Amino acid sequence: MEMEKEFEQIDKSGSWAAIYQDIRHEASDFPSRVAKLPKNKNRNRYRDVSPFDHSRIKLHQEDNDYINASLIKMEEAQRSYILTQGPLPNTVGHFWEMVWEQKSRGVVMLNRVMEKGSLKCAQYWPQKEEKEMIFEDTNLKLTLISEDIKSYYTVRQLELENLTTQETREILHFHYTTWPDFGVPESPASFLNFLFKVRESGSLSPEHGPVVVHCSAGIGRSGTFCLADTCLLLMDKRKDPSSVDIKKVLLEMRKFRMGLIQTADQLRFSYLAVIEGAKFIM
Ligand SMILES: CNC(=O)c1cc(Cl)ccn1
Ligand SMILES: CNC(=O)c1cc(Cl)ccn1
Ligand SMILES: CNC(=O)c1cc(Cl)ccn1
């Protein structure tokens, strides 16, 4: 079926939970043996969210190459994404090592450091220009260059230096700051505006490594971001845009990381975002 009318049919019939459970039943199951090794317990935030072995990002290190991060490669859309958990106190150096080694231009953050009175990720970037951060375990230096605070999101320019080679690179930090502590946004308008700002920066384009996107577990809000981006790109590329099937795209993405889209409300919000986005594109 088309999307917008499939949408009203699910609303009128109140069957979002049944649609979402079907997706959960059909989703791929692949091994994640490296994630579960005892030496990696303090590298995982949640015991039930792990990268598959076949798609995990490897650190260029011979001691321990493990990080909780996955490469999502969308062949028809010609887009790749790295989805990862919010960094932990003992993985902030690994996080920036990955950004460096994978040649990423942008980092997309969809959570606040504290939500619901608890810490959802480490404070992993500097908050003042004159107070830079040094990650001694991976030999990197990170400096805040500029910051632009808007009503729904903040954009930061960061300098990442590989202290071993003295090479430097400019990284863009795109921080969506207004996702509610509970539920999903009432309108997709600010989330779509944010997606378009990431696109306009070059961070999603083939001349760079894959964008790094995270929330707390790296599957819920993060899944919503890449699912909406890929569906809108396919609607632009194909002769028949009504052939784009959001449930089929989601199942393809779940071949590369488990659990993408965590609730039926997030599924409905993803439909809403793609529907409204397709009208603005033209
Ligand atoms: C759907 N996207 C494309 O077909 C495409 C084509 C090029 Cl050149 C770069 C990125 N994407
Ligand atoms: C060129 N701009 C867009 O294509 C766009 C699209 C959407 Cl959905 C929101 C904001 N900007
Ligand atoms: C019916 N057309 C569409 O849905 C559409 C959607 C997009 Cl994103 C571009 C062009 N056409």
Side-chain angles (χ1 to χ4, degrees), residues 35 49 72 74 76 92 106 111 114 165 187 191 194 219 229-230 235 245 254 264:
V49 181
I72 300 9
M74 301 304 288
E76 185 190 358
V92 173
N111 65 289
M114 177 166 284
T165 68
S187 162
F191 191 69
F194 175 76
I219 60 173
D229 184 51
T230 284
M235 288 176 77
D245 186 331
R254 277 193 179 216

Short mmCIF file of all heavy atoms in Angstrom, two decimals, residues 35 49 72 74 76 92 106 111 114 165 187 191 194 219 229-230 235 245 254 264:
data_model
loop_
_atom_site.label_atom_id
_atom_site.label_comp_id
_atom_site.label_asym_id
_atom_site.label_seq_id
_atom_site.Cartn_x
_atom_site.Cartn_y
_atom_site.Cartn_z
N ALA A 35 30.78 -8.92 21.33
CA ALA A 35 30.16 -8.04 22.33
C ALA A 35 30.02 -8.72 23.69
O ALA A 35 30.07 -8.05 24.72
CB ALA A 35 28.78 -7.56 21.87
N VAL A 49 21.60 -4.81 24.15
CA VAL A 49 21.84 -4.05 22.91
C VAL A 49 23.30 -4.25 22.53
O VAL A 49 24.20 -3.67 23.17
CB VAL A 49 21.51 -2.55 23.05
CG1 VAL A 49 21.78 -1.79 21.68
CG2 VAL A 49 20.07 -2.33 23.49
N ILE A 72 25.69 0.53 9.01
CA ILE A 72 24.45 0.33 8.27
C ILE A 72 24.70 0.79 6.82
O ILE A 72 24.83 2.00 6.57
CB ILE A 72 23.28 1.09 8.90
CG1 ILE A 72 22.92 0.73 10.38
CG2 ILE A 72 22.02 0.89 8.09
CD1 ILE A 72 23.81 -0.14 11.13
N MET A 74 23.30 1.11 3.08
CA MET A 74 22.05 1.06 2.30
C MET A 74 22.40 1.14 0.81
O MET A 74 22.77 2.20 0.29
CB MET A 74 21.08 2.16 2.71
CG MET A 74 20.70 2.08 4.20
SD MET A 74 20.00 0.46 4.72
CE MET A 74 18.44 0.58 3.92
N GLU A 76 20.78 0.54 -2.34
CA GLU A 76 20.03 1.29 -3.34
C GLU A 76 20.08 2.79 -3.07
O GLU A 76 20.19 3.60 -3.99
CB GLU A 76 18.57 0.83 -3.40
CG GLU A 76 17.77 1.51 -4.52
CD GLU A 76 16.26 1.27 -4.46
OE1 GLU A 76 15.77 0.52 -3.58
OE2 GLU A 76 15.53 1.84 -5.31
N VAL A 92 35.08 6.98 25.93
CA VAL A 92 35.12 8.25 25.20
C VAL A 92 36.33 8.30 24.27
O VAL A 92 36.26 8.83 23.16
CB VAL A 92 35.10 9.44 26.18
CG1 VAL A 92 35.32 10.73 25.42
CG2 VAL A 92 33.75 9.52 26.90
N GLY A 106 30.83 14.28 10.43
CA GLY A 106 29.82 14.72 11.38
C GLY A 106 29.49 13.67 12.42
O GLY A 106 29.64 12.46 12.19
N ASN A 111 20.15 12.85 22.08
CA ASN A 111 19.78 12.82 23.50
C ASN A 111 20.45 13.97 24.24
O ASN A 111 21.36 14.61 23.74
CB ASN A 111 20.17 11.48 24.15
CG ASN A 111 21.67 11.27 24.19
OD1 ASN A 111 22.29 11.04 23.16
ND2 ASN A 111 22.27 11.44 25.37
N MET A 114 21.88 14.37 30.54
CA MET A 114 20.99 13.89 31.61
C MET A 114 19.55 13.95 31.12
O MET A 114 19.10 14.98 30.58
CB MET A 114 21.12 14.71 32.92
CG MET A 114 20.14 14.24 33.99
SD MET A 114 20.52 14.89 35.69
CE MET A 114 21.89 13.83 36.06
N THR A 165 50.58 11.89 14.79
CA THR A 165 50.99 12.40 13.48
C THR A 165 50.85 13.91 13.34
O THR A 165 51.30 14.46 12.32
CB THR A 165 50.15 11.74 12.38
OG1 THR A 165 48.79 12.18 12.49
CG2 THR A 165 50.21 10.21 12.52
N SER A 187 4.86 17.04 16.61
CA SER A 187 5.04 17.33 15.19
C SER A 187 6.44 16.93 14.76
O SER A 187 7.38 17.07 15.55
CB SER A 187 4.85 18.83 14.91
OG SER A 187 5.41 19.20 13.67
N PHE A 191 12.33 18.05 13.83
CA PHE A 191 13.23 16.92 13.53
C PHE A 191 13.63 16.92 12.05
O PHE A 191 14.80 16.71 11.72
CB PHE A 191 12.55 15.61 13.89
CG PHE A 191 13.47 14.38 13.87
CD1 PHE A 191 14.46 14.23 14.81
CD2 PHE A 191 13.29 13.39 12.92
CE1 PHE A 191 15.29 13.11 14.81
CE2 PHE A 191 14.11 12.27 12.90
CZ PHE A 191 15.11 12.12 13.85
N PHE A 194 16.06 19.69 11.34
CA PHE A 194 17.36 19.24 11.82
C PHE A 194 18.03 18.30 10.80
O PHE A 194 19.21 18.45 10.50
CB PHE A 194 17.16 18.57 13.20
CG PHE A 194 18.41 17.93 13.79
CD1 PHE A 194 19.40 18.70 14.36
CD2 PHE A 194 18.56 16.54 13.80
CE1 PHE A 194 20.54 18.13 14.90
CE2 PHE A 194 19.71 15.97 14.31
CZ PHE A 194 20.70 16.76 14.88
N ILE A 219 19.67 2.83 19.07
CA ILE A 219 18.73 2.04 18.25
C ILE A 219 17.38 2.72 18.06
O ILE A 219 16.71 2.48 17.05
CB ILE A 219 18.56 0.62 18.83
CG1 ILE A 219 17.99 0.62 20.26
CG2 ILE A 219 19.87 -0.14 18.78
CD1 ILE A 219 17.65 -0.78 20.80
N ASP A 229 15.77 9.52 6.75
CA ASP A 229 16.70 9.98 5.70
C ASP A 229 16.67 9.05 4.47
O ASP A 229 16.53 9.52 3.33
CB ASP A 229 18.11 10.09 6.27
CG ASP A 229 19.12 10.64 5.26
OD1 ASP A 229 18.85 11.71 4.65
OD2 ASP A 229 20.17 10.02 5.08
N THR A 230 16.86 7.74 4.69
CA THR A 230 16.90 6.78 3.58
C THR A 230 15.57 6.75 2.82
O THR A 230 15.55 6.74 1.58
CB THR A 230 17.30 5.39 4.10
OG1 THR A 230 18.71 5.34 4.37
CG2 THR A 230 16.99 4.26 3.06
N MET A 235 12.56 8.07 -2.27
CA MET A 235 11.40 8.69 -2.93
C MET A 235 11.83 9.67 -4.00
O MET A 235 11.11 9.84 -4.99
CB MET A 235 10.50 9.37 -1.89
CG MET A 235 9.75 8.37 -1.03
SD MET A 235 8.71 9.08 0.33
CE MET A 235 7.34 9.64 -0.65
N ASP A 245 8.50 1.37 0.67
CA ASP A 245 7.80 0.65 1.73
C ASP A 245 8.60 0.77 3.02
O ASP A 245 9.63 0.10 3.17
CB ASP A 245 7.63 -0.82 1.34
CG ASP A 245 6.79 -1.61 2.33
OD1 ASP A 245 6.76 -1.28 3.53
OD2 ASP A 245 6.15 -2.58 1.89
N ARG A 254 17.60 -3.43 9.87
CA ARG A 254 17.77 -4.36 11.00
C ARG A 254 18.62 -5.58 10.66
O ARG A 254 18.97 -6.35 11.57
CB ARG A 254 16.39 -4.78 11.52
CG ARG A 254 15.75 -3.77 12.53
CD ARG A 254 14.54 -4.40 13.23
NE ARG A 254 13.88 -3.52 14.22
CZ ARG A 254 13.35 -3.94 15.36
NH1 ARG A 254 13.43 -5.23 15.71
NH2 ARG A 254 12.77 -3.08 16.17
N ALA A 264 6.14 1.24 19.26
CA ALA A 264 5.15 1.54 18.23
C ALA A 264 4.96 3.04 18.03
O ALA A 264 4.65 3.48 16.92
CB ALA A 264 3.81 0.88 18.57
#
